[PDB]
């Protein structure tokens, strides 16, 4: 299936000199709706189990520092300023990356799937600042874009065929 | 075990010529309360998982018309007046069927067992009119009865034994 | 694929005792929108091919009579009053049929796959009357509904997956 | 060859409940012409030989009473009233058929092969009435249709090509 | 042979730092005018099949920032500035890449091949901007340059041979 | 165990210009406390014995320059300014270093084991510079961070369980 083979654009945020290192930039809940083509197969299905694959494009240049933090989050866990994101396991990502950095957030649930509507405890992807970034020239440029894609992972499936104009 | 091996009689309901299409006719939840044999072993146990069968059998004869239809409804759907029955897995049930019809009910859960007194999420078997009855004759009969017999599946079993006199 | 192993209903017609012999009740174009789970799923890709199955449910009662004849027109033939259904190759439906009866039309197409939004030449399945219909007792019955289901063939297959924002 | 492989479409008579028993509702000599498309391929070729298949529809219902008889007749035997069908080797069809009845009527000839425009001697096929018809209801329906339809045996074929313009 | 076994220049383009996300800086029809040698030898030819492989050269430095997306759009779908190019099988192009970024075009074609001078229904490929080009040192340099080389691939072959002086 | 197969954060120490070459920059003692993890471990231990891994990440710029030496001391060496990192078994980490650089530290003991609280001799490690660092633009940055990560190593190990609420 060439709809869990390829990459596509979920979204992106903006990393600037102002963020001091332990800021939290982005985050994300573990679902089916961030990804297009798994959004729209949503819709004739009653649940859905399994993991997803993350990648972050950073459209920096050569002349820039600093570094983010990433790191998956357990179900029941609080999420605030007070999170230790680089105590938990986790990836590292540079300003001046050329190649995009990939972490797999898997499917950790207490149950044995998820109902489409209440998926009930999931876990959570968090982006933090591990260096602050840093411009040498100074100038104008303060700031700068990361681009997020995403794609199924191998294990990943839906469950319990329905009619499409039901509702949850 | 001779009280897995026959159906037994669990209902009836009716069916009349002034039953519009897409009406409900007949609906339960998944439960070992629809079987006379499994009713009285559940006073000693603390939990269930597994299917049921369930037949049907007409009581018409070979002059009328109209046919309904039976489904399975996953669990965390919504059961009303527009639930398109017609667009899920079904079977199809005739006025004049001779023989009974059978359809099997799965467990389908999202925890490993349901606990006595408190089941969590359970599936649901809906009987809907598919076209409606008709009796060219025009007399005094305007409606016939539809008996319900269950069965458990091989699957079925119970867990965790308790005292008799114990509360859930 | 749970999507592609049961039938689903599609349409619904009636047939009356009025309907003289050779009289066209249903007609249809060979389409992914035949069914409830393709025309989802052709939002998201840009090509198909493959055949359909269609099933017919005669709402009849033992007392009826008359019979139905259902074929597929090749593309490139005139549909209309003067089309002889009778001397293609053909199915036949009786008034009092207790099973469904099914008939595969194939994707007979002279082009590779079938453009969405522009599928070209394609097939047509045509429903006309074999012998009139007729009732005995002569009471306020004088027509019968007739009921559609499809289910796609083995050989059905999309192509060239594309953005669902696009347009055709 | 698909022109032989399907049944289609030959003739039609009626069968009301006036005709007494013993009389005669539909006689056919063997001959090319019987079928859709052997009339056309006899347009090429001087001789034929082989047995061709009938099969009977009979648009009744399940009220109706009554059975017909048919049967062959060999060549150099005369066609008439005083004619005991029911004592030839036959087949019985009755009012309220479902399933079509077929019969097959064999090349029997005391040539080699059968000259395009003077065949010689050939078989008959004769449908007459067993039981008369009878309608328990006594209304207004005092006759049934019954559809005939044609398919070429295994061993026909045609010999001999010949110029399309030329005259027998 | 050599004519198919290196790269060719075909074109070169310019992106700026005023181009917004999402617009698009490069569009080309499938065809064998896309590369030298082929439009040479299309001259003695009725048809065509195969795809082409198309390659990137960026001209840029170590100290700019910015990214862009290609991909192929399939036959029968507009080409506007409302299209996700993003949300396609898509390559990522870098605006300080050292090496050449390569993305092959199939022939996705409802015909069997494409006659010379109507080829009918054909893909086309897309360039355009991901993310905008940043400049850090704000000087006179405000856009860069993209050379475009081909190559037919494997598949790509001739048919039909014909007179060089004879009109299409 | 996923305690002992991720790097995780231990301390950050800050690089600049003015440092000269030769000097320190940061010392720290071979115990289970530079870990997050063995830390909470070794309260219900007595003992404990192995190496550990160290890992360094460098928030600097493509246009910096200038390189730090790193190497183990072994017990029984006085550590001050007149120590000669260089002329140890090192390794090299450059303020452009894209990818981080690892350095193991041995359990480098004349004993068997280290009691907990009293651990008696042991190795240190030590980073000091090895060539100034330099900014040829010469603006408001002269100083860079470099954040230090520690995993266990193969062979670390922990003796001796104990009541957690004893005193060493």
């Known amino acids: 299936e060439t709809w869990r083979t390829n990459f596509y654009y979920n979204d992106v945020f903006t990393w600037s000199v102002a963020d001091a290192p332990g800021n939290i930039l982005y985050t ?52 605030g300023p007070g999170l230790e994101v680089r105590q938990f396991p986790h990836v590292v990502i540079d300003a001046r990356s050329l190649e995009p950095v990939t972490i797999t957030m898997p499917d950790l649930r207490p149950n044995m799937y998820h109902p489409t509507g209440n998926p009930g405890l999931v876990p959570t992807l968090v982006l933090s600042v591990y260096n602050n970034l840093i411009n040498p020239f100074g100038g104008s440029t303060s700031a700068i874009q990361v681009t997020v894609e995403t794609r199924p992972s191998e294990d990943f499936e839906f469950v319990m065929i329905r009619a499409p104009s039901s509702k949850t």
């Open 28 to 79: 994300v809940q573990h679902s089916p709706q961030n990804n297009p083509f798994t959004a729209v197969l949503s819709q004739m299905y009653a649940g859905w189990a399994g993991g997803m694959q993350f990648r972050f494009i950073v459209a920096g240049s050569g002349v820039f520092g600093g570094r983010l933090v990433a790191a998956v989050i357990p179900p029941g866990i609080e999420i």
